[PDB]
Design a protein around this ligand. Structure first.
Ligand code: PRO
Ligand code: PRO
Ligand code: MH2
Ligand code: MH2
Ligand SMILES: [Mn+2]
Ligand SMILES: [Mn+2]
Lengths: 484, 483
C-alpha cells in the first residue's frame, strides 16, 4: 500500500498504520456495552489559522486524534468511521479554481482515496447528506479533558449535525486508551525519530564551543533534523539551557529565548526533540560546555545516570510509575549525601520529601503523537498530592506497548533550596557550606525514550551517556555535517 | 538607552524606536478632531497559545500593533498611552511562584520599566484600578478590518472596562497610518533583515545541487537566518518551488510541503523571508538549479529583470502604484513577444488584460511588522476590479517612508493559459508552437524590498540579479566580485 515519505533517507510510513488504528478503535468500541449498533465515529480535522488579524499563515499541523485515526496532512477535512464495519470516509474541501494558481494542483476525490487508503472520499459540504444516507443510530464525537493542559477536546460540528443523535462522552476514553498502546508500525516511527534526534544530539555535542549562543545550537539541531530527517514541525520549543539556565525546567520560550552565551565551566542541558509526520520524540542530553567534566559536574551527572539506569533496569509490566519516581528520589538523595551536600538518614529525607527539592518535576511521561501524550490519568487513576509526585503526568502501572520518557534530573533551584533551608524538617539535612558551591550550577537531566515490553523495556534512544562517552564524543574531529 | 539584542553580530534595536512610535501616534491623535482631552490608548498584547487541546506550546510572537507601540516580547501584557502627555504604562502578568521553577526568573516591575523604557509598570490585574485613578474621558481601543485577511482586529478588554467610556473607531486608521510610514530607526531594522536574508539567499544559491529536496534548501536558509541573524520566527512559510512548482504562487504550505526533488534543467523560485524582533522582510530569488541559464531561462528571467528595474527606476513620491503594476505588465508582454511566445500588437494585448495571464498577482505590497503590512486600502482607496490589479495589496500613491516589495514575475500556469486560448479576445496573441516549449517551465519572480524616498527609492535588498551575477554566486565567487 501507499506510504508517507519525504525522500532521501527519511522513513516510509505506511498508511496501513492508520487503518490499523481505526480497526483497533472499532474493536474497543464494539466491546463497550453502551455503544449502540449503527454508531459512527465523527472527527473533525484542524483548519488553517493566521496570526492575530493578519494574513500571516501559521504552518498547519494536524490535530492529534484526527492524525492518529487518518494520517491526513491537509487542513479543513473531516473523517468518519462506521463502528460496526470499520468503513472509513474522508471528507475533503471542495476547492476554488483559484487554488490552482496560489496553492497547487486540485486533486480528485479518487486521488485522496488512493493516498490515504480509506474506503470512500466525499466533499465536506456533503457531510450531512452522506451521514444521513447511512442512517446512523448515533454519532460519536470527541469531548474530554486533557490532563496536562486542562483543555477540553473540541467536538466535531457541521451544519445539520443538530438533526442527529450525538454522544460526546463514550469516544474520548476509548480513543485515548488506544493511543496509550503503540502498534509495531507506530514504534517504527518512534525508533526513527529517536535515531534522527540521537544523531542530531551527537552533532550538537561535537559542534558546541565556548562563546556560542544557546540558540546557535538549537538552530543546528533543527537544521539536522529537517534537512536530514524531514522533521519540519516542532513538537515543543527546544530547551538549550547553559549555566544557571539548566535549572529552569522549560527554559527557551519567548520569555527566556535561549540567548545566553555558553561559558567555560558551564553545564549544558539540551532538551531537544520534535516530530516526524506528527509522531513525537523527546530526548535530553547534559554535558560540560568545555568537553571535560569537573569533579562536581561528574558527581551530579553520575547521580542522574545512576537513577536513569536503575529506573530503566526496574521497568517492566506491573511496575507502578510513582514507585519509579520515588526510586529516583532516593537515589538522588543517596548520591547528594555521598557528595556531602546532604547529611543524615536518607529514610528521613524521603519522609520529608527532600527529593522534590532537587527534582520538582515528574520522572517521565507517556510519549506519542503528543510529546506529553494522552491517557496518563484515566478515570480511576488519581494524581498524588505530594511534592514531585504531583507533577507526574501519569500514576499508572506499566503495561506492554506503553511509550515513556525516563528523565530524572537534579537541579539547584534557589527558591526551592531557600524554602527547604527555612524549614526545620528539611534544613538539618542540608550542608549549607557545601551547597553554596552549587548555587548557580544549574542542573542535569538525562532523558531516554523507552517502550514497555512483555519482559522489561526497549530503549529507543542512542546517545553517549557515560562521562567517558560524552567526553569522547565532544573531542571528535568529524563533524561530518558542516553547513557554512 | 536599552536595546534588544541577540548578541554576536545581530542588530541592537534601541527601545527608543518604540517610544518614538508612541510619540508619533499621540501627535497624530492630538490633531484628530474626534479626539478629546484625557483620552488613553489601550492595547492588549498577545497571549500564549497551545496546539489544540494539548499542552504543546506554540512559540509566542507578539501582536503587531502592540509590538509597534511597545516592543514587548512577553505574553499576557497590556499597554496604555496617555494621549495628552504621551505617558506610557506597561501592564505585565503577576506570575505564580512556580514560574521560577519552570519558566525562569520572576522579574520585578522595575526590571520591565528599565527594559522597555516606559514611564510606569503595573500588574495586569490592576488595570481597572489604575485607569480609574487616572479619570480618563475615553479609552481608545483597536478595531478595524485588515484588508489582506479580512479579519477584524481584536479590541482590548478587561474586567471592569464596561465602567469606562470606550471608543473603538478612532484609533485603528490612525495607528495604521503611522505604521505605513517607517521611521529611520525602523529602517535600520529592515536594512538588517534584508542584509541577513540576502546573505542567506546567497548561501542557498551556493549550496544548491541537482538531486536535493526543496526543503533541504528551506532548512539551510532558516539555519543561516537563525544562527547568524537571530531570526527565530517565520513571517510566512518559505516558498521553495522547483520546476513546475515555481508556477504555484504560495507553494510550500502543508498541502504542498516543498518535497520535490530538484532536477537538472529546472528553474528554482525561492521566496524566503522572515523577521527579526517582529520586523519582516520578504525576498525572492530565481535561478537555474544546475547553475547555468539556458537560452529560454535567460529570456524569461531577463524579462522579469527588466520589469523589476523599470519599476524601481520609475518609483518616486506621487507615483500611483497601479501604474507601476501596469508598467510591469506592459514590459512582460513586450518581452514575451520578443521571445516569440506572443505576437501582435502589445497595445491590444494590454487592452485585453493579457498581462494577468502571466502575472496573476499584485506587483508588490507594503512591508513592515507584517510581511503584508497594514494600510494598503484606507477609506477612500478602492480595489481595481481588473485581472492582476484586483490582487494588488495597495492602490495608494507612493510617499516617502513607505516600504514596498517590488516583485514582478512571469509564470506558465496551465489553466490560465488554457483560458486565454479559449477566449477569442486573447487567443490570437499566443503562439502555441513556441508556448508549448514553456509548458511546465514554472516561472520566475524577482522580489526586492525598497523604501520610498524623496528622490526615488532606497533598495534594501542586495542579492545577485543579473544572469552573470547569479552564475558567479552559484559558482562560489566571493562578494565584491563584479562581473
Ligand atoms: O514537562 C515535563 O514533564 C518534563 C520535565 C522536564 C522537562 N519536561
Ligand atoms: O501574496 C503576494 O501578494 C505575493 C505574490 C507572490 C507571492 N507573494
Ligand atoms: O523532557 Mn524533554
Ligand atoms: O512575495 Mn515573497
Ligand atoms: Mn520529556
Ligand atoms: Mn512579497
Amino acid at each position: 500500500g501507499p506510504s508517507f515519505w519525504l525522500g532521501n533517507e527519511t522513513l516510509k510510513v505506511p498508511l496501513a498504520l492508520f487503518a490499523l488504528n481505526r480497526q483497533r478503535l472499532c474493536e474497543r468500541l464494539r466491546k463497550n456495552p453502551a455503544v449502540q449498533a449503527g454508531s459512527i465515529v465523527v472527527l473533525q480535522g484542524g483548519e488553517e489559522t493566521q496570526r492575530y488579524c493578519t494574513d500571516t499563515g501559521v504552518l498547519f499541523r494536524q490535530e492529534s486524534f484526527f492524525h492518529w485515526a487518518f494520517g491526513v496532512t491537509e487542513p479543513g477535512c473531516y473523517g468518519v468511521i462506521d463502528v460496526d464495519t470499520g468503513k472509513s470516509t474522508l471528507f475533503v474541501p471542495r476547492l476554488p479554481a483559484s487554488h490552482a494558481t496560489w496553492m497547487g494542483k486540485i486533486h480528485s476525490k479518487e486521488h485522496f482515496k488512493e493516498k490515504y487508503a480509506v474506503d470512500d472520499v466525499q466533499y465536506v459540504d456533503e457531510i450531512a447528506s452522506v451521514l444521513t444516507s447511512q442512517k446512523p443510530s448515533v454519532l460519536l464525537t470527541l469531548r474530554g479533558v486533557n490532563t496536562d493542559s486542562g483543555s477540553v477536546c473540541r467536538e466535531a460540528s457541521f451544519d445539520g449535525i443538530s438533526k442527529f443523535e450525538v454522544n460526546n462522552t463514550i469516544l474520548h476514553p476509548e480513543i485515548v486508551e488506544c493511543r496509550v498502546f503503540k502498534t509495531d508500525m507506530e514504534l517504527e516511527v518512534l525508533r526513527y525519530t529517536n535515531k534522527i534526534f540521537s544523531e542530531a544530539h551527537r552533532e550538537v555535542m561535537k559542534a558546541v564551543k565556548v562563546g556560542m549562543k544557546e540558540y546557535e545550537l538549537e538552530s543546528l539541531f533543527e537544521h539536522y533534523c529537517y534537512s536530514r530527517g524531514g522533521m519540519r514541525h516542532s513538537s515543543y520549543t527546544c530547551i538549550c539551557g547553559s549555566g544557571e539556565n539548566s535549572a529552569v525546567l522549560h527554559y527557551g520560550h519567548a520569555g527566556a529565548p535561549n540567548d545566553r552565551t555558553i561559558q567555560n565551566g558551564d553545564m549544558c542541558l539540551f532538551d531537544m526533540g520534535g516530530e516526524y509526520y506528527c509522531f513525537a520524540s523527546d530526548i535530553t542530553c547534559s554535558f560540560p560546555a568545555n568537553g571535560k567534566f569537573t569533579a562536581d559536574q561528574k558527581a551530579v551527572y553520575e547521580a542522574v545516570l545512576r537513577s536513569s539506569r536503575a529506573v530503566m533496569g526496574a521497568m517492566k509490566p506491573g511496575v507502578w510509575w510513582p514507585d519509579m519516581h520515588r526510586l529516583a528520589d532516593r537515589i538522588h538523595l543517596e548520591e547528594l549525601a555521598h557528595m556531602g551536600i546532604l547529611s543524615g538518614s536518607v529514610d528521613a529525607m524521603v519522609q520529608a520529601h527532600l527529593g522534590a527539592v532537587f527534582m520538582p518535576h515528574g520522572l517521565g511521561h507517556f510519549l506519542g503523537i503528543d510529546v506529553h501524550d494522552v491517557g496518563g490519568y484515566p478515570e480511576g487513576v488519581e494524581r498524588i498530592d505530594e511534592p514531585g509526585l504531583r507533577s507526574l503526568r501519569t500514576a499508572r502501572h506499566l503495561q506492554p506497548g506503553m511509550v515513556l520518557t525516563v528523565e530524572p534530573g537534579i537541579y539547584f533551584i534557589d527558591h526551592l533550596l531557600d524554602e527547604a533551608l527555612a524549614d526545620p524538617a528539611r534544613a538539618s539535612f542540608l550542608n549549607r557550606e557545601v551547597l553554596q558551591r552549587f548555587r548557580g550550577f544549574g542542573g542535569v537531566r538525562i532523558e531516554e525514550d523507552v517502550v514497555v515490553t512483555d519482559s522489561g523495556i526497549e530503549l529507543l534512544t542512542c546517545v553517549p551517556r557515560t562521562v567517558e562517552e560524552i567526553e569522547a564524543c565532544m573531542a571528535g574531529c568529524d563533524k561530518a555535517f558542516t553547513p557554512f
